Amino acid sequence: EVQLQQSGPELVKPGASVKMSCKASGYTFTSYVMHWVKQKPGQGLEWIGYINPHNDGTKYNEKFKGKATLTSDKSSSTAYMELSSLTSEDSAVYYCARKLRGFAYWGQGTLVTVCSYEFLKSWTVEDLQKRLLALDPMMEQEIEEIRQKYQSKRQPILDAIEAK
Amino acid sequence: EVQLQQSGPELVKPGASVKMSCKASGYTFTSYVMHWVKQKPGQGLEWIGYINPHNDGTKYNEKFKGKATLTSDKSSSTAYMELSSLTSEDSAVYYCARKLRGFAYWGQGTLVTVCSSDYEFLKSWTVEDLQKRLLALDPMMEQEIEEIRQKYQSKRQPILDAIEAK
Amino acid sequence: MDVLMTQTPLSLPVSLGDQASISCRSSQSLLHSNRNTYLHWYLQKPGQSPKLLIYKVSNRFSGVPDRFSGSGSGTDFTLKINRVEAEDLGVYFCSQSTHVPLTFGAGTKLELKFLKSWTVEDLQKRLLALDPMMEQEIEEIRQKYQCKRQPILDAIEAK
Amino acid sequence: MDVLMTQTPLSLPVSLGDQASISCRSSQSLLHSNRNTYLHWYLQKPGQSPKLLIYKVSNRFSGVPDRFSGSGSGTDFTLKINRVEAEDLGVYFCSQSTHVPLTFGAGTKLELKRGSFLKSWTVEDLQKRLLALDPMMEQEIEEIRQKYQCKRQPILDAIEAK
């Protein structure tokens, strides 16, 4: 089975760089051009560019010259994309996809989150640690609300199945 | 009536400065301290600081020390906020609010949107290519707005139905 | 270390008439040395400005309906809605001014979990609550396209 | 200049079994000089990756249901669905590769006006739909997890530096 296996989520500060990976298996890596697409959450697909692993040739959307750098390594059957000097406009899911007659095979996508300090130096060490721990139940509260939202949506389907 | 009338929405390139105003009417401007508060949508409100118009004294949230400067003007009955060197993280609604027991009175909010970086590659376009694209944004905007309008007509209709043949 | 304000639940489904309870917890006691406790409760409808409901834990602000009540002490406070109305839907948050800096809780959504059992007044209130919601989203679009217009204008004006 | 792709509508509500039709207009014609018309259709279910539906206006990719058909020429193309089913809900994008850079439409969301005739669904479709909500929940939870990751970072940075 063809699989485009992309690297896990990335957590970056503004201005940093991130290099992500797309490991193909189940076909001859060098026989196909590898494309990359950006998708900001809740918005459209943007085409970044491609690399041809057979000869390392690359093409870039003008909207991404300098922002993205595409490479590949034949021995590892892996395509890489490096994004430089990140901003909040770069936080998005990044997909690799194999093209022949179109984008038939897609990776699962790599999520890049660009986060934000000073004033915290006024705090004591114990005050920082207590606040770090207070974050954990706060996360769980948010996640538990999401879980219940989806429990509500599932139950009528689950009921229709039970009453078959 | 007491009213805090804030200046309209702002569009800022990052790293710049922006100054907004909070025009008080219907009470003695100097008698009450004016506060400022930030709200990014879906985030909680953060207190920025206050200005005391009676003596021009201020206090700042340490988190916004260096980001905001509060001023006031008696003759204008107006409080101001300047935000310095905006990043995308400064995109938010900013309220002014008068305090006594709590914030009984709030301005309507100034919306500050920090833009992006596209000029880089756009300098290579022809003026016609540019002017044709600049115009193509107005149909794209109207289509998005009409999506919003329809989404809300959907929410209105069951309510309007209940009202009709009530 | 400023005082952290946490609320429970994050979302509360109701129908018009039930009791609602919204809890607010502080990381530090809000009892001031002057023996007052500066904890306040607010309501913000989406697309609107917040409005003061309760000050000093249990004092109803002038004009707020009597079905609203608040209580508590030290680090733990409750807001209660006795028989919820339609104009009460929206976001409730607490605030503290005992300690500098002033801090707010992030808010509890009182939502609606049938419209024919409502009165025409209630339906009219609910219909009007949709207007600031729509204008909020539309203005967001209008500003987005402003940002979109700038880079082209900057290039055209550079010839 | 990049080719603009306009999709209409932006959101399209239907009921299961209805006919859906989705339009896509390109700011310049998609007929290549070598005479192929490189227009493609994709469906992306929420929380999932896009999948190819049609290539070159009207050719269904190997495995795509018969109810999907594509048509058009030059600047105007339509995707049609005969008898919409629950697994067809999602975001349909059009794309063109006649011109460089490759470009996409903004997307058309196909959703339910107000849904349920649930007892008339087959067992398969009911359980398929449950499976369809699982990545929708994973994306939303992943979002909270990465949000709190950012909230932890400056605090952990401050701890190490004290």
Residue numbers in the entry:
A (entry chain A): 4 to 119, 123 to 170
B (entry chain C): 4 to 119, 121 to 170
C (entry chain D): 1 to 113, 120 to 165
D (entry chain B): 1 to 116, 120 to 165
Provide the authors' own sentences about this structure as they appear in the paper.
Anti-DNA antibodies (Abs), serological hallmarks of systemic lupus erythematosus (SLE) and markers for diagnosis and disease activity, show a specificity for non-nucleic acid molecules, such as N-pyrrolated proteins (pyrP) containing Nε-pyrrole-L-lysine (pyrK) residues. In the present study, to gain structural insights into the dual-specificity of anti-DNA Abs, we used phage display to obtain DNA-binding, single-chain variable fragments (scFvs) from SLE-prone mice and found that they also cross-reacted with pyrP. It was revealed that a variable heavy chain (VH) domain is sufficient for the recognition of DNA/pyrP. Furthermore, we also observed that the binding of the VH domain Abs to pyrP and DNA was significantly inhibited by NaCl, and that the mutation of arginine residues to alanine or asparagine reduced the binding of the domain Abs to antigens. These findings support the hypothesis that electrostatic interactions driven by the arginine residues in the VH domain Abs may be involved in recognition of DNA/pyrP.
Finally, to investigate the molecular details of the binding of the anti-DNA Abs to pyrP, we performed X-ray crystallography. We first attempted to perform crystallization experiments using the VH domain Abs DO1 and DO2; however, they were not crystallized. An arginine residue (R97) in HCDR3, an important residue for cross-reactivity, was observed on the surface of the protein, giving the Ab a broad positive surface potential. The presence of such arginine residues was also confirmed in the antigen binding site of several anti-DNA Abs. The X-ray crystallographic analysis revealed that the arginine residue in HCDR3 confers a strong positive surface potential on DO1. To investigate the possible antigen-binding modes of the Abs, we performed the docking simulation using Autodock Vina with the DO1-clasp and ligands (pyrrolated peptides and DNA). The results showed that the pyrrolated peptide and DNA mainly interact with the VHs of the DO1-clasp, especially with HCDR2, HCDR3 and FR around HCDR2. In FR, W47 and Y50 interacted with a pyrK residue in the pyrrolated peptide and guanine in DNA. In addition, K58 interacted with an aspartic acid residue in the pyrrolated peptide and a phosphate group in DNA. A docking simulation analysis indicated a similar binding mechanism of DO1-clasp with DNA and pyrP.
